[PDB]
Design an enzyme around this catalytic site. Structure first.
Site, PDB file in Angstrom:
ATOM      1  CG  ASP B 429      -1.510   1.159   1.664  1.00  0.00           C
ATOM      2  OD1 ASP B 429      -2.311   1.477   2.260  1.00  0.00           O
ATOM      3  OD2 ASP B 429      -1.221   2.254   0.813  1.00  0.00           O
ATOM      4  CG  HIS B 432      -2.144   4.299   3.950  1.00  0.00           C
ATOM      5  ND1 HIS B 432      -2.635   5.603   4.450  1.00  0.00           N
ATOM      6  CD2 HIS B 432      -3.392   3.777   3.434  1.00  0.00           C
ATOM      7  CE1 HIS B 432      -3.682   5.717   3.983  1.00  0.00           C
ATOM      8  NE2 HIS B 432      -4.296   4.701   3.402  1.00  0.00           N
ATOM      9  CD  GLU B 436      -3.319  -3.065   3.918  1.00  0.00           C
ATOM     10  OE1 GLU B 436      -4.019  -3.593   4.585  1.00  0.00           O
ATOM     11  OE2 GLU B 436      -2.537  -1.852   4.565  1.00  0.00           O
ATOM     12  NE  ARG B 464      -8.783  -2.471   3.799  1.00  0.00           N
ATOM     13  CZ  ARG B 464      -7.794  -2.990   2.830  1.00  0.00           C
ATOM     14  NH1 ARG B 464      -7.909  -4.192   2.520  1.00  0.00           N
ATOM     15  NH2 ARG B 464      -6.513  -2.215   2.732  1.00  0.00           N
TER      16      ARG B 464
END
Lengths: 84, 470
Positions: B429, B432, B436, B464
């Site tokens: 990711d 950020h 993940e 998710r």
């Protein structure tokens, strides 16, 4: 600076077969211009499929001999300050 | 396994490959001045970029095939030294590729596939070693995605003098930017022959002859990529949007000028046809007055004056018939002058409209040219760099995996890794700066992990998953 992170996998098994980092291009991202890939949201943000027409344009920067007939290739445009 | 008419370097050999492959018979000899000159011009120090000159146009519909359901190929050869940045001879016998200053690729510009030479950016070509055959002078070369080559080169032999139906040299020879999909259907290579063969290295480019439908797919692709580029380069976009206005304006000027010529000629013809009608009517008016002058004999068949009256009628008909032809010609001239007047006026209109258009463009070009533009290094800081596979700690042995999850912004796919014997998937990711994790079989989210430690930063989010991408 900018480095081309190339990775490739076997077309049938989809298993990882290798990875190579091109030299550092510093702040020269003209390579992405030759590929027609905008800088916006694409530096340190995604891997791109190495389409056929791109091989002749990328092969100059890698020791590995791109073989799209046996493998699938991906390239990301990674950028970190200074050498790394 | 076939044979072919000797062809010269630069010539685009058209053929429909057999089960044996492609036959390539080269008529050796310094490349033509025409081609050599084009190549010289193409190298002209232009701004960095890939530039090209279309040498030939391909016309699918004109291909003289055995069965329309075929795959024709166009094979263009050139001396390797004329292409390579460094003499092929001065190259390690174990090299698989070589840098080149020019390549012959297939490019699509205006709904048409063409064969062009391109240059202006670093490029590489595969180096294929040709192998011997039972037939002397005949070698085989296997290029990536192309039929096997049965190459043959002769120091001095005839050369085909004319292009085969399906390929024409009538093209826009101007230097232009190579397309996004340049060489999309071409496979080329430098072919080096056996040690003591005696043949110099030969560059060969094989292109598929695209069908009207396939040409369209390429063009649409060119269009889409151009739009994505324009969308991300406001200035560059405004530039070509203005240059385009510059041209449309000029074309509107040549338009008005052409209509002023049409009108000027229409006026000339009008006046001329009018005079001819005016004179024709005089004659007619006098023949009619003449019948009147002798009408007193109209009922006296016996009098000689009846002959004068009768003759007058004949003269009047001949004069009327002429007036009728004159009237038609004059009416046509009148309709032409009227249409020319409206057309000229209409051109005047569009020309004015074009003038405003170029103003909005020339202005916008400056507005976008006065804005602050971020450099490459700035972009390199918009997102967090991805860790090196061997630097991701706390998750055991990781192996890269085929990227598939689409990125939110841009055109990439998230960087993917594999762990726990291919049961856990980790994607980077970049917004950020964290990994993940996802369950391989389910695709369900496992949580956020720190690359440096491997510790869990956040737990599983039921909402998710990436099942849609494995």
């Amino acid at each position: 600076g900018l480095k081309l992170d190339l990775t490739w996998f076997d077309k049938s098994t989809e298993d990882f077969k290798g990875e190579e980092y091109s030299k550092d291009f510093g702040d020269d991202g003209s390579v992405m211009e030759s590929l027609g890939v905008p800088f916006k949201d694409n530096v340190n943000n995604g891997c791109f499929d190495v389409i056929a027409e791109w091989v002749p344009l990328l092969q100059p920067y890698f020791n590995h001999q791109i073989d799209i007939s046996d493998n699938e290739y991906f390239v990301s445009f990674d950028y970190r300050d200074g050498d790394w | 396994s076939a044979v072919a008419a000797p062809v010269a370097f630069g010539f685009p050999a058209l053929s429909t490959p057999g089960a044996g492959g492609l036959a390539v018979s080269i008529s050796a000899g310094a490349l033509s001045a025409a081609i050599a000159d084009i190549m010289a011009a193409l190298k002209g120090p232009f701004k960095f970029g890939l530039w090209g000159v279309a040498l030939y146009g391909v016309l699918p519909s004109q291909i003289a095939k055995d069965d329309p359901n075929m795959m024709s190929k166009i094979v263009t050869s050139l001396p390797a030294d004329d292409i390579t940045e460094s003499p092929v001879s001065s190259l390690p016998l174990d090299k698989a590729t070589v840098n080149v200053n020019v390549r012959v690729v297939d490019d699509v510009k205006d709904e048409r596939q063409n064969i062009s030479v391109v240059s202006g950016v670093p490029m590489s070509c595969p180096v294929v070693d040709a192998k011997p055959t039972e037939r002397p002078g005949v070698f085989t070369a296997s290029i990536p995605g192309a039929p096997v080559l049965n190459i043959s080169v002769n120091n001095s032999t005839p050369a085909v003098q004319t292009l085969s139906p399906g390929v024409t040299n009538n093209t826009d020879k101007d230097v232009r930017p190579a397309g996004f999909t340049q060489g999309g259907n071409t496979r080329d290579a430098v072919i080096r022959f056996p040690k003591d063969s005696g043949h110099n290295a030969v560059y060969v480019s094989v292109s598929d002859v695209l069908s009207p439908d396939q040409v369209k797919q390429r063009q649409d692709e060119e269009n889409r990529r151009q739009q994505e580029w324009d969308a991300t380069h406001p200035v560059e976009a405004a530039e070509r949007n203005y240059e385009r206005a510059r041209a449309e304006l000029n074309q509107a000027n040549e338009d008005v000028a052409r209509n002023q010529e049409r009108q000027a000629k229409a006026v000339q013809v009008y006046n001329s046809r009018k005079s001819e009608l005016d004179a024709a009517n005089k004659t007619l008016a006098d023949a009619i007055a003449e019948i009147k002058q002798f009408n007193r004999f109209a009922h006296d068949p016996m009098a000689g004056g009846h002959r004068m009256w009768q003759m007058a009628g004949l003269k009047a008909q001949r004069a009327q018939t002429d007036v009728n032809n004159k009237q038609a010609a004059f009416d046509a001239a009148a309709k032409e002058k009227s249409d020319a007047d409206a057309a000229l006026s209409s051109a005047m209109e569009s020309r004015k409209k074009k003038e405003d258009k170029k103003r909005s463009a020339e202005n916008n070009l400056n507005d976008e040219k006065n804005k602050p533009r971020k450099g490459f290094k700035d972009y390199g800081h918009d997102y967090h760099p991805a860790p090196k596979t061997e630097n991701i700690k706390g998750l055991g042995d990781l192996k890269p995996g085929i990227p598939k999850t689409p990125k939110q912004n841009g055109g990439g796919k998230r960087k993917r890794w594999t762990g726990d014997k291919g049961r856990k998937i980790y994607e980077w990711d970049s917004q950020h700066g964290e990994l993940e994790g996802y369950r391989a079989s389910d695709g369900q989210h496992l949580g956020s992990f720190d690359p440096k430690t491997g510790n869990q930063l956040k737990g599983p989010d039921p909402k998710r998953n990436i099942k849609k991408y494995l």
